[PDB]
Amino acid sequence: NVVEGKFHVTGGNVTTAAAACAVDAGSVDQTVQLGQVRTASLAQEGATSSAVGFNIQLNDCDTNVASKAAVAFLGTAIDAGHTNVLALQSSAAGSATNVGVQILDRTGAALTLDGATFSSETTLNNGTNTIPFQARYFATGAATPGAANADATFKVQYQ
Numbered sequence: 001n002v003v004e005g006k007f008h009v010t011g012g013n014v015t016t017a018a019a020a021c022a023v024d025a026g027s028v029d030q031t032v033q034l035g036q037v038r039t040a041s042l043a044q045e046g047a048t049s050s051a052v053g054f055n056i057q058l059n060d061c062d063t064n065v066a067s068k069a070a071v072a073f074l075g076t077a078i079d080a081g082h083t084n085v086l087a088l089q090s091s092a093a094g095s096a097t098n099v100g101v102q103i104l105d106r107t108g109a110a111l112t113l114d115g116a117t118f119s120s121e122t123t124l125n126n127g128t129n130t131i132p133f134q135a136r137y138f139a140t141g142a143a144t145p146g147a148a149n150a151d152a153t154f155k156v157q158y159q
Contacts (some may be wrong), residue, residue, distance in 0.1 A: 001038045003096040003148035005088070007032040007103075007135040008052070011071070011154030020066035020124065021058035022159045028035060030054055032135050034101065034148065041141035051104060051134035058129045066104065066158035069122050071131055074115035075152035084110040085138045091147040100140050101150035104134040118157055120121035131156075145148055 010029045014018040037049045056071055076087040078100035085100035102110040105119035122131050138146060 001145045002036050003039060003042065003099055003143055003145060004006070004036045005034055006100055006118060006153040007034055007146050007148035009154060011056070011156070013152050014155045015158045017066055017158065019060035019156070020079060021069065021129065022061065022131045023154070023156060024057035024059050027056045036133060037137055042137060042139040043080050045139055045141050047139040048102070049137035051136040053132060053134050056133065056154065056156065057126070058131070060159070061124045061126055061129055063126055067124060068159045069124055069129065069131065070120065070144050070157050071133070071154050072115055072157065073111055073152045073154045074120045075113045075150065077113055082138070082140055083114065084112050085140065085151060086113060086150040087157045088153060089149045091149065094146045095144040096148040097144045099137050099139050099143040101136045101147060101148070102136055104136065105153065106132055110138070113152060115155070117147035121159065
């Protein structure tokens with residue numbers, strides 16, 4: 001009686017303004033294992049699984065172009081009442097219900113997933129910089145077992 005799955009995320013720079021950095025090729029397409037979580041530990045709205053880390057690495061940054069970077073994520077919100085929780089992908093094995101996936105920035109806050117809400121700003125050094133994130137399961141009710149995969153895309157904005 002578990003939910004198990006992965007978080008798949010792809011992304012790149014905002015392309016409508018100058019980019020201070022290149023996005024590392026290892027960060028533009030990643031899959032984060034969310035783990036095996038018993039539904040008993042996701043039995044009520046608000047319950048969350050232990051978060052799993054993932055990073056977005058930026059290379060060759062020039063702080064004369066911009067001093068800060070942040071990341072916005074886009075994905076399907078699980079419902080209108082939880083716009084910072086990703087809906088699960090469908091699966092042949094039958095996907096879990098009443099549970100979605102959240103993306104957290106360094107501050108621990110779950111991020112809105114509408115492509116317009118940027119994470120906390122990271123002050124850049126020249127060269128390589130890493131922006132750390134986390135992913136976890138979030139229960140919108142009594143979770144039911146089954147595959148629990150989610151996907152999203154990201155854009156890196158410079159300021």
